[PDB]
Design a protein around this ligand. Structure first.
Ligand SMILES: *[C@@H]1O[C@H](CO)[C@@H](O)[C@H](O)[C@H]1NC(C)=O
Ligand SMILES: O[C@H]1[C@H]2[C@H](O)CCCN2C[C@H]1O
Ligand SMILES: [Zn+2]
Length: 1014
């Protein structure tokens, strides 16, 4: 295995190093506003060395933005695809590329057979070409790699089944900045080339001057270069026609033939296109070839890519004709005028890349190597697109909940083959497609109109219900004696209980387990662990009595803690935010221990008085002017006091000290150790009163954040043997620190209410000497080193925090793991900060046409890990990556893939069993089975199950960390007949494996395997 820590890769362009050297000056470059006046030598191209130009028609189709998916499909996309089929069928030389398979599948399934056959023929013969082939063209900042792979696989599996093609070239013209997680996944999915567009204008200028816009993009830790994927970065401000022919938009706009008037479009540079005729073709070709030769100066081969398209283009027949006929007149003239030394034609994206690599193999060009990312994007001036790292945070959090539910549903149901009447494949396909749709660059980004956001939310809610159905049917099958199992596939045997979604204070969605001497003495509950190692985690359930005890199914007592159910209220009468306790619902908490990829059953039983193995939390309300808080049968009375500093310790774990306002002020790791200053603070950013306004995309603060005025907030302290917590009602946020014996969990119930033009940030202040360095993750896959640059404005130093961030010095590290993608930064040495929500009254002029005024309460979750790192083997100072410790990685897993909880729905479960998966191997902690998916329906003689295996890389810090078992996914199901390593989408077999054994993968690698069973 390659060492991903100790060897700094030698690359021609390393983005962090480039960033440190670049000046980022925004100078007026002339007609190329963010470049320079390009010059070329007319003698470069001659009879024996022509410029080959590929004009590639395209249509950018968003699966929701200003309209919903279905609205756009009915108003625009179905007409574009119908007319593309007719026009390409009738004009053999015309070409077209298509990226969004969610729309193509929605169209193709509605076509009659004659037209399906016509469509298959224009794909087979190369006229219509699929680029990327994902369900969507995903956001690259907030998306988790697991969901980027899910949506790629959904679209490519559809393409292989119905079109018999698998794209090897990717097209990403609109995501707002670009992540190296894309070439990572694409190169492991058979790709050979990719194209990107939205990178900082200063980066385009810098790379264009060096002819480094085409490069072999490798991962930041890849010393050898095996992850490299050829990448083409487009050079200009947009993918529209004015910005794709060459450097001067006033000229290029005249070659967008849809802008002459009858289509309601025009050129803002005030020179319109004119129909090509024999009298003007020479002058028009002179202008166009000059633009092309200038664009060609920025690249190394004699093959030039000229995209021809824009949003929802090629809709009308008349548009297809106006673009095609005018370009064909230009080609016939240009290609016959020897003096131009150009051969131009319509082409596809793969045709362009194939010709570029032909030139490379002929020794005509060599390409530079590059590592790093392309965040944070700015399209002009100081307009950095860091706002969408936080916009619509409720749905960003929902994405991560559904991510996990889809993984758990596919894994739980994969163990068996199901009859078609069970509708398992139907519900899983629905769930995968709704989560895949939301990866769109106007979905998870929070950049769609309000009614479109509602549509995505509705689709994800249906997907969660589908996952629940499949999971609970699977648990019933896996834990019931087979000769007793009697499924009704529409019945609810179990209901899921989720303590953090939508979350306390967001929705009352959780069911209370109702026990009583005159109704039901006990209830079975089951936990599922999707991770491939044995795992313990505290779990909680609501119960109708505080006198409840827990047992396992061998009837062994399990230690439990009962706490009250506390709900916070913004009291419009007293004008305080304070908690109310239930006098009939209680929380019971206990430690569940679950096998790798397995299930464990427990029983909750009521008694008439305090059970021997259940303890009760104390509760202390700190506030001026308290009033009583009765809790019914709960056996400890609530205590009261004036606000004061407090300290708590659970188990052996850290001791946390809190200010009188209920906010952390220090962490002491052990009895002997220093109380390390770690302070939480909430602040607010505002908006500029003149000039550009913040909106869904842009973060344009009116200076550094100001502290939220806290008043004298009400603080609630709950102290228990298994779990303790401090919660405080602050303006717009109920902030909660929970202790269970290890790193604390932080929960914020964020309700920005009616605070217009405000962004609420949570900051951590420490004395760690981090300087200008901090680390953030990319897509939950890798941590990249960031350097705060004071030559850039505050908003440019914000980066996506899809799953975690950290700061460190020689001795100490503070890592904040997140359960949802949000924006964040380290704006000063020793600080970390992460945005919670933002409410903006103005539109930011990128086309959305609204501010963000649709906020709703959201429960954000985190883990906060303070550690000594002086003993850890870390990368050298020049390495661009960082790596988590074991405790931080486990804390991230606790947020993203918690245990699932099921409550048996009827009175008695006949045939119940105690555990499933006790014989599953418990794999080393850095290995995960990211995906387990049965790939065949029950009628297939040979069953196939696919697995995606990912190994992260954890720092070595001196812990022996020892005995685990090798995980061979091909032997997890019986009767294995074959084991193959495949691409990550499962669509191509790459290696037949000896002994039907699937080897584990190397650190930072991901592999896929398919086992076949007879
Ligand atoms: C699918 O494509 C392959 C080549 O890529 C071809 O050999 C095979 O016949 C095709 N199957 C069809 C036409 O469905
Ligand atoms: O995705 C839509 C929109 C983005 O939301 C912001 C950049 C311009 N894009 C055009 C549309 O495709
Ligand atoms: Zn778009």
């Amino acid at each position: 295995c390659q060492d991903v820590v100790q060897d700094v890769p030698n690359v021609d362009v390393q983005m962090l190093e480039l960033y440190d050297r670049m000046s980022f000056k925004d100078i007026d470059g002339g007609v190329w506003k963010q470049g320079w006046n390009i010059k070329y030598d007319p003698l470069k191209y001659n009879a024996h060395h022509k410029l080959k130009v590929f004009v590639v028609p395209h249509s950018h189709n968003d699966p929701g933005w200003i309209q919903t998916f279905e609205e756009y499909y009915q108003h625009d996309t179905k007409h574009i695809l119908s007319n593309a089929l007719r026009h390409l069928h009738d004009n053999p030389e015309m070409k077209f590329i298509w990226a969004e398979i969610s729309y193509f599948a929605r169209f193709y399934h509605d076509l009659g057979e004659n037209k399906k056959l016509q469509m298959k023929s224009i794909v087979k013969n190369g006229q219509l070409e699929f680029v990327t082939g994902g369900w969507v063209m995903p956001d690259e900042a907030n998306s988790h790699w697991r969901n980027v792979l899910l949506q790629l696989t959904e679209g490519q599996t559809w393409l292989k089944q119905f079109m018999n093609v698998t794209p090897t070239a990717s097209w990403a013209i609109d995501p707002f900045g670009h992540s190296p997680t894309m070439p990572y996944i694409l190169q492991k999915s058979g790709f050979k080339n990719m194209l990107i567009q939205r990178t900082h204008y200063s980066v385009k200028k810098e790379l264009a001057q060096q002819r480094q816009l085409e490069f072999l993009w490798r991962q930041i830790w890849d010393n050898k270069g095996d992850t490299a994927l050829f990448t083409h970065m487009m050079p200009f401000y947009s993918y529209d026609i004015p910005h794709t022919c060459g450097p001067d938009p006033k000229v290029c706009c005249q070659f967008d033939f849809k802008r002459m008037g009858s289509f309601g479009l025009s050129c803002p540079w005030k020179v319109p296109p004119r129909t090509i005729s024999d009298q003007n073709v020479a002058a028009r070709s002179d202008l166009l070839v000059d633009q092309w030769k200038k664009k060609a100066e920025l690249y190394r081969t004699n093959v030039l890519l000229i995209p021809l398209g824009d949003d929802f283009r090629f809709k009308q027949n008349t548009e297809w004709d106006v673009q095609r006929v005018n370009y064909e007149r230009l080609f016939e003239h240009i290609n016959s005028q020897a003096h131009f030394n150009v051969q131009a034609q319509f082409g596809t994206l793969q045709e362009y890349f194939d010709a570029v690599h032909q030139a490379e193999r002929a020794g005509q060009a060599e390409f530079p190597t590059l590592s790093g990312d392309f965040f944070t994007y700015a399209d002009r001036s100081d307009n950095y697109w860091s706002g969408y790292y936080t916009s619509r945070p409720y749905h960003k959090r929902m994405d991560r909940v559904l991510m996990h539910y889809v993984r758990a549903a596919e894994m739980l149901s994969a163990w068996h083959s199901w009859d078609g009447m069970a509708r398992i494949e139907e519900r899983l396909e629905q769930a995968r497609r709704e989560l895949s749709l939301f990866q769109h660059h106007d979905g998870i980004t929070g950049t769609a109109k309000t009614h479109v956001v509602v549509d995505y939310e509705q689709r994800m809610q249906e997907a969660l219900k589908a996952c629940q159905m499949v999971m609970q049917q699977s648990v019933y099958r896996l834990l019931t004696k087979p000769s007793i199992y009697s499924p009704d596939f529409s019945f609810s045997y179990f209901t899921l209980d989720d303590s953090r979604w939508p979350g306390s204070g967001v929705e009352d969605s959780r069911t209370t387990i109702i026990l009583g001497e005159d109704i039901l003495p006990s209830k079975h509950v089951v936990m599922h662990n999707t991770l491939p190692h044995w795992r313990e985690q505290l779990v909680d359930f609501y119960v109708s009595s505080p006198f409840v005890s827990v047992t396992d199914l061998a009837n062994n007592p399990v230690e439990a803690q009962v706490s009250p159910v506390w709900s916070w209220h913004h009291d419009t009468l007293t004008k305080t935010i304070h908690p109310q306790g239930s006098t009939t619902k209680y929380r019971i908490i206990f430690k569940a221990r679950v096998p790798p990829m397995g299930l464990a059953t427990y029983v909750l039983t009521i008694s008439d008085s305090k059970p021997e193995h259940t303890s009760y939390a104390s509760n202390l309300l700190l506030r001026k002017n308290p009033t009583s808080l009765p809790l019914g049968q709960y056996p400890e009375d609530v205590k009261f006091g004036d606000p004061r500093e407090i300290s708590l310790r659970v188990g052996n774990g850290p001791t946390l000290a809190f200010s009188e306002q209920g906010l952390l002020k220090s962490i002491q790791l052990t009895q002997d150790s220093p109380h390390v200053p770690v302070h939480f603070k909430f602040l607010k950013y505002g908006v500029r009163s003149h000039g550009d306004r913040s909106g869904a995309y842009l973060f344009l603060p009116n200076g550094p954040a100001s502290p939220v005025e806290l008043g004298q907030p009400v603080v609630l302290v709950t102290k228990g043997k298994l779990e303790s917590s401090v919660s405080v009602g602050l303006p717009s946020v109920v902030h909660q620190t929970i202790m269970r014996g290890g790193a604390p969990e932080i929960r914020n119930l964020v309700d920005i209410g009616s605070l217009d033009n405000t962004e609420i940030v949570m900051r951590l202040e420490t004395h760690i000497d981090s300087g200008d360095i901090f680390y953030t993750d990319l897509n939950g896959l890798q941590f990249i080193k960031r350097r705060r640059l004071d030559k850039l404005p505050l908003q440019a130093n914000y980066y996506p925090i899809p799953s975690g961030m950290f700061i460190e010095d020689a001795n100490t590290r503070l890592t904040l793991l997140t359960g949802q993608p949000l924006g964040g930064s380290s704006l000063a040495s020793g600080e970390l900060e992460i945005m919670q929500d933002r409410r903006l009254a103005s539109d930011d002029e990128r086309g959305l046409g609204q501010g963000v005024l649709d906020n709703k309460p959201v429960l954000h979750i985190y883990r906060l890990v303070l550690e000594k790192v002086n003993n850890c083997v870390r990368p050298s100072k020049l390495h661009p990556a960082g790596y988590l410790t074991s405790a931080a990685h486990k804390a991230s897993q606790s947020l993203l893939d918690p245990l699932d909880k099921f409550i048996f729905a009827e009175n008695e479960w006949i045939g119940a069993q105690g555990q499933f998966g006790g014989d599953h191997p418990s794999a080393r902690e850095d290995l995960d089975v990211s995906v387990m998916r049965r790939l065949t329906k029950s009628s297939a003689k040979t069953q196939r199950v696919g697995y995606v295996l990912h190994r992260t890389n954890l720092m070595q810090c001196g812990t022996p960390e020892e005995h685990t078992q090798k995980l061979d996914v091909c032997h997890l199901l019986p009767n294995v007949a074959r084991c193959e390593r495949t691409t990550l989408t499962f669509l191509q077999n790459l290696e037949h494996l000896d002994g039907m054994v699937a080897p584990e993968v190397c650190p930072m690698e991901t592999a896929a395997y398919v086992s076949s069973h007879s």
